[PDB]
Symmetry: C3
Subunit: 373 residues, 3 copies
Amino acid sequence: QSNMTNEMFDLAKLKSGVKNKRISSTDPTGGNRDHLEPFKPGEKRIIADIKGMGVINHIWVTIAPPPPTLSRNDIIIRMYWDGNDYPSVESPIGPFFGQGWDERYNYASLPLSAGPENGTGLSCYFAMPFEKGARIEIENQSDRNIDAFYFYVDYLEMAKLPKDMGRFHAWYNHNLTEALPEGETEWGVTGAQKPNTTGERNYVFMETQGKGHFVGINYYVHCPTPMWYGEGDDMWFIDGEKVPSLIGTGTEDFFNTAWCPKEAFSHPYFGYPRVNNDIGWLGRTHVYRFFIEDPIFFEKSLKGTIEHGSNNNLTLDLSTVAYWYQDSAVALPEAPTKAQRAPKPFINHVDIHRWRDAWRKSKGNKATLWGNE
Amino acid sequence: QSNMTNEMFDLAKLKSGVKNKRISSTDPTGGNRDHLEPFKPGEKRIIADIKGMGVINHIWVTIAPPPPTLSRNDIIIRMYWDGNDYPSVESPIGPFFGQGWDERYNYASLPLSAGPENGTGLSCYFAMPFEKGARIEIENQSDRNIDAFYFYVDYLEMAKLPKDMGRFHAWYNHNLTEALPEGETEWGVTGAQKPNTTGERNYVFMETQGKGHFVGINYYVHCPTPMWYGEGDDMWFIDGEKVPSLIGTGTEDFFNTAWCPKEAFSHPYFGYPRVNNDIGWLGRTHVYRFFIEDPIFFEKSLKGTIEHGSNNNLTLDLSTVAYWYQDSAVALPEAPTKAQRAPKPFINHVDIHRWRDAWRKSKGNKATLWGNE
Amino acid sequence: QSNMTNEMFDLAKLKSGVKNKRISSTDPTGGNRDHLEPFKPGEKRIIADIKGMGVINHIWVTIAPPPPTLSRNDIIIRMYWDGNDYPSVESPIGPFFGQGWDERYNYASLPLSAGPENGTGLSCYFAMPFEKGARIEIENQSDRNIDAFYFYVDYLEMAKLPKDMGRFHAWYNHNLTEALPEGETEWGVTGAQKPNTTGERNYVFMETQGKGHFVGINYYVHCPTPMWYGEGDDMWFIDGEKVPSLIGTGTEDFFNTAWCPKEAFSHPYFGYPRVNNDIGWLGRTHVYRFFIEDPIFFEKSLKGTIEHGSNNNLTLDLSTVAYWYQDSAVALPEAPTKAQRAPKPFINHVDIHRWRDAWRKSKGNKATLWGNE
Ligand code: NA
Ligand code: NA
Ligand code: NA
Ligand code: NA
Ligand code: NA
Ligand code: NA
Ligand code: NA
Ligand code: NA
Ligand code: NA
């Protein structure tokens, strides 16, 4: 028999052992109230409770009111596989679908998109297998109601789950990174740079034990300086090795770009859906990269890290969502609290005028200091 | 042996049992008249007659004159598999390739595209297997000539067609949908809304008997009201079930979008290549969704439907092309006639001023009626 | 067992026999000098020397200084598989990654992209298997230094390479094509057109012996006339056949477009990332097409050709990069020299005024000749 194969060729092959199912917010009366009842502040709800074996292969969500009125940073999505009491997916729902902070913007990637109206149509094509059921939970951590929650959870019911199917995991993390004690010595501008041989102070976006592979990252940086935020290298520790086997060159480099960019760009596997649009790199940037053709495999453990500036010198407000598969459904670290992951104010002309004043004082307050002394 | 696989990894594997063939409109003399002879009005022609086993995996077409001079709504493409006297593909050629009405516009999706010059380069990457030959027919239903028809039909000749290969089907449908007897009660604005528990009056875009899976839809709506046209739910009846197992929440929702959008957007699997660009949602919108990673499977039958407004309250000029695979090549319903599928005029300021006059009369013709009473 | 499969479904399957490795320009001291030492003019260097079995599945590169200061047409990339003393990949690095001439511009295709800042982030997702090692070499053919060369070479080490894995090949070619002796008779404007039954004078972008399949072409045309450059048909000779089995209709047609286009357009498999932006088609156009779902297979040999204007009538500055797989790593033809592949000057208003003068003289220099006589 011919071994011919590719996406469109295989689509033409008849498939066995699959049956479509869908859980949705469809109005059960047949009317047009095709959304769930409102969520009060703090309310949790199981929106999908599936029994047995299957594979989720399409999720769509939308929410009313839209951002900024109702921040999608403050609505949590959690997924529990195989009857476990812990979630293997836990994230603010906006960041999970590639919508950072309390913002909205259209973009398309192969697994995740935020489509019209202006980023409110959320869709996900990651496949999520399960053997002993699946539970999807929504939690309203906002101070106002979720007036209307709309969704589709499309999946294939299977009489027999193929034996090598993994379990989908996703974890949101957030840190306000700490500058070096000597200050933000990026590019050696304010002081001498030093080597980072260990990755000890790197930001950690993923850490797990098991067998599997890393498949993606949504990276949300809010930079409080106009200085370039992305000199930092990615560094991966596979299967408990002492020296990281995968070491990068820069953050834009890791995201398949170069030369401190700040342009919107789209590829199915990587892109910049939201750029800072201000002096230097001051403000917010969202970057993503999916490792679909090129996952990062591990047989025992994986620790995915990235420097926050060269040798971790910068103070950055950084959040990430990491996506991966592993052989069984495992637990995640504690989630950042609502207060911990709150979006930060944009640094503005008043703040920078105060920096200029402290800088003028450090130079002896000469009446005609320009600013480049 | 390693089970490593993905699109780019598998592309690097040597393939057995395939041989390239191509039927094209190439000038047989070696000159530069690389198109077919003109088609007179009403003329049919078999443009490709393939014997034996194979898989079509790339089609490109262009036509002269371009639209609006020669409407691609009035040139029919038909495909016959395995020596059958009925077509398993039947559609106006523009709508088949994602060009609605008598229009032209650039767009790209994974299986279908209309590229430059301004939507005239038509391409298709759906795989189309056949065991006992294939015939592709073009029919000119325009009142003028097809001056020049250009094409490529690329396929792989196979000594043995792999046994689980399905057959590609596509069907164009059109309806001028009927409003409810009480009128167009969308959003409960003109009167009370009622439930749709059965889907009895839904628009039907696909209905077949066999084993296979649905893989796509091109949806062409011409809305004669500024009111939002897409509150309607998709509803699928799999294998003759009485209650539909897949029920949606809205039309934009089904197309992975939200909040009554009218923005151009592109994803390999879904998008809005043509938007209404007028008050509310008055005018023409083209939406598509391909179910490549997430097909709708069936073992005995499938009926794919969608409401035309909530509880089918709206009058919409709707046409669709549905794409699917099934185990054997089957027949399609009768095609809409040329008159039935004719594009409708755009509702304009004169028409709406006449509506305003009837509305003023219904309010007693107060000399200072504003319009929001 | 279910035969369910597709890209996202298969991504969820656990994989065996693969281990990630990466060679990069990471600063070995842990500092922030994450690029290689400068290359002097003429200097060659092996940047990656891998032993054993594996598959490269992601490459990223950037270079300092950027274009036009340092032309990426004058930095050569070469790849040697299985310990061979000849390269199976040989190309100027800009053209290899879809950046023609000495230019820079953002674009994205599925296998190759040039991302921000303004086309400097080069990435490649072609899979490149090898059984007895791999060597990647960079040669500086510029008259100035490569100040900083940055890269990632991501690959999977395999204990056993699956047996049907091919070898990746890529070859850059360049020709200043010769007009017909009677002149540039395109469209029969300057004289009678004649048939091309043999393809004898066609431009050759690929020629090899072995078993495999063609997967892509980057086509870089610099047209010195405003006349349309793309009437020329693609013509393929498979396995030494006398009459080419695959014959096209036009160059834009071959690139899934139509009607002499000159619009930027993007599809994962084809597109126009750089268009001429001048009268007619005068100037530079970059077109690409990847044959991922629809490769051109061969069991013994392949010769890929295209006319340079109908019946090869035009003088075009043409360069191409062809990409393919075959069963073993084979040698390539001699590369064009630096002088041979040098970008040509743009034809300008002064040049055309001189053409007008020769044309006026040919018409007898009537004092009021308009130009359309
Ligand atoms: Na519903
Ligand atoms: Na409903
Ligand atoms: Na760095
Ligand atoms: Na031809
Ligand atoms: Na020809
Ligand atoms: Na609805
Ligand atoms: Na490094
Ligand atoms: Na470093
Ligand atoms: Na031609």
